[PDB]
Amino acid sequence: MKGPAFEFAVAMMKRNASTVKTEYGEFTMLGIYDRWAVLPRHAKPGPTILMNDQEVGVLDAKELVDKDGTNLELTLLKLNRNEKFRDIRGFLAREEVEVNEAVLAINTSKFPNMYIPVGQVTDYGFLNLGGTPTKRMLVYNFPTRAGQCGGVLMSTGKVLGIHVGGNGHQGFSAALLRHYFN
């Protein structure tokens, strides 16, 4: 069923998600713990971002790659703000998870407070995303539109990944693994 996934998704977004603008567009951003949040790599945050229409400094940013050097399509960023995020690392899986029912949550000025039942999530692993070899790719059927990147892919009790791309038929998430936030 879908209800409990939506229930989890709405509560998660309310506590931990925000709308972010960089020079490269507008994205959903998920806070993970302390002042560390995650964005799609192609958001390419500069020294300042707009977070819920307010200027926020970036203290540090990390474009994640695997131990082999392969792109993961995620950027971790540390925000210059006093408030800490609710620690949601316990809702991240230690390995890539496949599910029969997932929900994708988007929150930007173009897609405010929207949730999409995406159905089955399949771990495709190593893929080529627009020329760039990328691994730990989760794939789901989705009539994708631009402006949805940073979307948070969830199932009941788990944050599975961050939406980083689409081709109009499938959507693609980078798996959000717990060890990224050691």
Author numbering: -1 to 180
Passage from the reporting paper:
Coxsackie virus 3C protease, like other enteroviral proteases, is a cysteine protease with a characteristic specificity for glutamine in the P1 position of its substrates.
As described by our docking studies, exclusively the electrophilic C-2 of 14 was attacked and covalently linked to the nucleophilic Cys-147, forming a stable tetrahedral Michael addition product. As a result, 14 is inserted between the solvent-exposed β-strand E2 and the loop formed by Thr-142, Arg-143, and Ala-144 and occupies the S1 and S1′ sub-pockets of the protein. Other than the reference inhibitor AG-7404, which is attacked at C-3 (see asterisk), the C-1 carbonyl oxygen of the ethyl amide in 14 is oriented towards the oxyanion hole and forms a hydrogen-bonding network with the backbone amides of Cys-147, Gln-146 and Gly-145. The N-ethyl group points into the S1′-pocket. The pyrazolone ring of 14 is sandwiched in the S1 pocket by π−π interactions with the peptide bonds between Arg-143—Ala-144 on one side and the Gly-164—Asn-165 on the other side. The pyrazol-5-amide NH interacts with Arg-143, Gly-164, and a water molecule that mediates a hydrogen bond to His-161. The cycloheptane shows only weak electron density indicating the flexible orientation of this part of the molecule at the protein surface, a van der Waals interaction is observed between the ring C4 atom and the side-chain Cβ atom of Ala-144. The modified warhead structure seems to favour binding through an additional interaction with the oxyanion hole and with the π-stacking of the pyrazolone.
